[PDB]
């Protein structure tokens, strides 16, 4: 879905949306995402990157390029090998071979729950495919095609959903608005969002170039 | 590093 996201971003950016801007008319409540990353912890110098999704499921992308996901029921597990092969297990019944990884996941889970703010908390299955950080942002690519970009300095966030051709923007006051990209082309948007969308295009290009 | 505290 990355190339579709790139085309959607090309189209909106080429329309020069910030140049009468009628940004409010580009909002679409029907396009609100189901999943996004609400918390994350970068322990990649030792273990990997842990994260919580907005449904309270947690996942780790380990340094050996495997993934373990704990469902929000707190017992059901999905393990994804490097090849991409999925296995389904539980904490109550797992092979000894995954003990190390499960214990690491539980520690990440407990820490995030206790210590980090839940992004998009005021709003009512995929795993982390890859991620990277720049000086400005962390970029999270989910297995359902969604791409999330969290900007460090001002705490603003984009969630890009190529299947809906939509983008959710969480601003500095933590207001959460979801826009149809084609409506941003039609009605325009503020310079702030337009700038973030230009950055997003460059980030999606990075994902595509490092496949 | 961590997400927002």
Curated annotation (Swiss-Prot), chain A:
GO molecular function: anaphase-promoting complex binding; ATP binding; identical protein binding; magnesium ion binding; microtubule binding; protein kinase activity; protein kinase binding; protein serine kinase activity
Main location, first listed in the record: nucleus
Tissue-wise expression: Placenta and colon.
Record annotation: effect of changing residue 118 to R: Severe mitotic defects leading to prometaphase delay. Increased localization at kinetochores leading to increased levels of phosphorylated BUBR1
Mutagenesis or variant effect for residue 40 to F: Loss of centrosomal localization and of S-phase progression
Phosphothreonine carried by residues: 124
Region of interest (Important for interaction with phosphorylated proteins), residue spans: 155-157
Residues joined by cross-link Glycyl lysine isopeptide (Lys-Gly) (interchain with G-Cter in ubiquitin): 118
UniProt protein name: Serine/threonine-protein kinase PLK1
Stretch of the intact protein here: 373 to 594 of 603
């Amino acid at each position: 879905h990355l190339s579709d996201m790139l085309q959607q971003l090309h189209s909106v950016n080429a329309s020069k949306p910030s140049e009468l801007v009628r940004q409010e008319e580009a909002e679409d409540p029907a396009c609100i995402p189901i999943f996004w990353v609400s918390k994350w912890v970068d322990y990649s110098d030792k273990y990997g990157l842990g994260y919580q999704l907005c449904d309270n499921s947690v996942g780790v992308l380990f340094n050996d390029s495997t993934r373990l996901i704990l469902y929000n029921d707190g017992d059901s597990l999905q393990y994804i090998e490097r090849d991409g092969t999925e296995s389904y297990l539980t904490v109550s019944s797992h092979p000894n071979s995954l003990m190390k990884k499960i214990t690491l996941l539980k520690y990440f889970r407990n820490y995030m729950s206790e210590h980090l703010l839940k992004a998009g908390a005021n709003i009512t299955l995929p795993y982390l495919r890859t991620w990277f950080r720049t000086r400005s942002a962390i970029i999270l690519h989910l297995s359902n095609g969604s791409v999330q970009i969290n900007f460090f300095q001002d705490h603003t966030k984009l969630i890009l959903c190529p299947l809906m051709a939509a983008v959710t923007y969480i601003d500095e006051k933590r207001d959460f608005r979801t826009y149809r990209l084609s409506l941003l082309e039609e009605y325009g948007c503020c310079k702030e969002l337009a700038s973030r969308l230009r950055y997003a295009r460059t980030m999606v290009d990075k994902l595509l170039s490092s496949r | 590093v961590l997400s927002t505290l």
